[PDB]
Amino acid sequence: VKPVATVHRRIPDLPDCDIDKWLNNFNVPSPLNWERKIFSNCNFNLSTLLRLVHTDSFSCNNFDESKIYGSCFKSIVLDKFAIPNSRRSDLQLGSSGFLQSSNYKIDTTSSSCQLYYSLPAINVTINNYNPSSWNRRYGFNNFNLSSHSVVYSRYCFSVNNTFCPCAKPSFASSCKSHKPPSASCPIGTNYRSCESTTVLDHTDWCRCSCLPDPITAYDPRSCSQKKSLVGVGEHCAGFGVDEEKCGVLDGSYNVSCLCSTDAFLGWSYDTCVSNNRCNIFSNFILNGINSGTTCSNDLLQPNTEVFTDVCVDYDLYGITGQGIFKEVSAVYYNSWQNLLYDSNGNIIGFKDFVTNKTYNIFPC
Ligand SMILES: OC[C@H]1O[C@@](CO)(O[C@H]2O[C@H](CO)[C@@H](O)[C@H](O)[C@H]2O)[C@@H](O)[C@@H]1O
Ligand SMILES: *[C@@H]1O[C@H](CO)[C@@H](O)[C@H](O)[C@H]1NC(C)=O
Ligand SMILES: *[C@@H]1O[C@H](CO)[C@@H](O)[C@H](O)[C@H]1NC(C)=O
Ligand SMILES: *[C@@H]1O[C@H](CO)[C@@H](O)[C@H](O)[C@H]1NC(C)=O
Ligand SMILES: *[C@@H]1O[C@H](CO)[C@@H](O)[C@H](O)[C@H]1NC(C)=O
Ligand SMILES: [Mg+2]
Ligand SMILES: [Mg+2]
Ligand SMILES: [Mg+2]
Ligand SMILES: [Mg+2]
Ligand SMILES: [Mg+2]
Ligand SMILES: [Mg+2]
Hints:
Blueprint: E1 7-9, H1 19-23, E2 27-29, E3 35-39, E4 43-44, H2 46-52, E5 54-61, E6 72-73, E7 75-82, H3 98-102, E8 112-120, E9 125-127, H4 133-137, E10 149-153, E11 157-158, H5 169-172, E12 194-199, E13 202-208, E14 226-227, E15 267-271, E16 273-274, E17 277-287, E18 294-296, E19 311-316, E20 319-328, E21 339-341, E22 347-351, E23 358-362
Parallel strand pairs: 1-19, 2-9, 4-18
Antiparallel strand pairs: 3-7, 5-8, 6-18, 7-17, 8-17, 10-15, 11-14, 12-13, 16-17, 19-20, 20-23, 21-22, 22-23
The structure holds a molecule of 2 linked components (GLC-FRU), 2-acetamido-2-deoxy-beta-D-glucopyranose (4 copies) and magnesium ion (MG) (6 copies).
One 2-acetamido-2-deoxy-beta-D-glucopyranose binds near residues 16, 45, 47 and 48.
Protein name: Spike protein S1
Function: Attaches the virion to the cell membrane by interacting with host receptor, initiating the infection.
């Protein structure tokens, strides 16, 4: 870990981070649409936080939880979502289950903490939201689910920007066996790939891509929906669509390509409620330990001396460097701010808010 600077001063009047207010928001997202908030340049209290959220468990990975208290970070990145009861074990670090394959991958290389907490069920409304623009482009609007149902994707699929799920009306019109539904595709997209053959006594046997469906496809290579595991920081690329439920039978070019709601596959849901509270997950990413101005107020930090006349590494109101400090009478401190810069933008002076002493800073 990068050590704390020998001369360190915090910015004195920063606002509270209010992490608990965000975690306790009653509009709780599902893992499908996990929410992120970045906290910076503010003071937080881990001890208070764990009491104000009804914490069940808190632990850290690649970091010592006990070292958070009294520390400063460049930023704290918080991700959160309600936990479907059946998926809880998916959140073990490194797990290949549904939550981390297809909704939210917990980064195991960063310094992070995982907080398990809960909210009273009667006040909670789950926000299930499909993040996939291509799903939405072709018909997906909302879920229609009980209160406290929490959606999760099982399988995600990506497509390129020329994707369209509907067979071409001109192609479908001559099919006699297994005619696909059809519609016009947007300009700049390619119609669903389809072929007509004879076979046995079927003169016009039509088959298109992604059969039986993109999850169980006989031939993934010819299906334009491509399996995709979520990476760190990503959301599900999209539910696979049953292309046989996109368009309409005998649809012409006057109907726009749209997939029925039940065409979107590979997802499920479970309640988050146990003991009449909704169980929630949050992940903390700790960026730049022992730097920055996102600082714990859990401790009465006893401010140390401003060591003078010696080369010193410093972290002053968020700005870092090394130099020699020499105390000066106030007359020689040529500015009104707590830091003093030269023509080239380098720090040449410092006022200590703790003592009101003023210092020149020289290079080592
Ligand atoms: O006797 C000079 C003495 O004063 C210091 C501050 O303690 O420097 C100040 O005085 C100089 C004026 O002659 C300025 O050039 C300088 O910028 C100002 O800070 C010391 O640096 C010096 O020993
Ligand atoms: C939760 O809901 C109940 C009933 O709807 C209400 O009485 C209570 O004040 C709510 N709690 C909060 C914190 O809003
Ligand atoms: C939503 O689901 C319920 C069943 O839980 C059903 O009765 C209702 O018709 C559905 N509404 C819509 C708009 O699909
Ligand atoms: C999308 O993939 C298909 C592969 O069948 C290809 O024909 C099409 O040109 C691709 N579009 C882009 C923009 O890469
Ligand atoms: C942080 O915790 C300390 C130690 O109990 C307390 O003195 C201080 O008031 C707390 N600050 C906030 C903003 O909760
Ligand atoms: Mg804030
Ligand atoms: Mg296609
Ligand atoms: Mg292949
Ligand atoms: Mg399942
Ligand atoms: Mg995070
Ligand atoms: Mg001087």
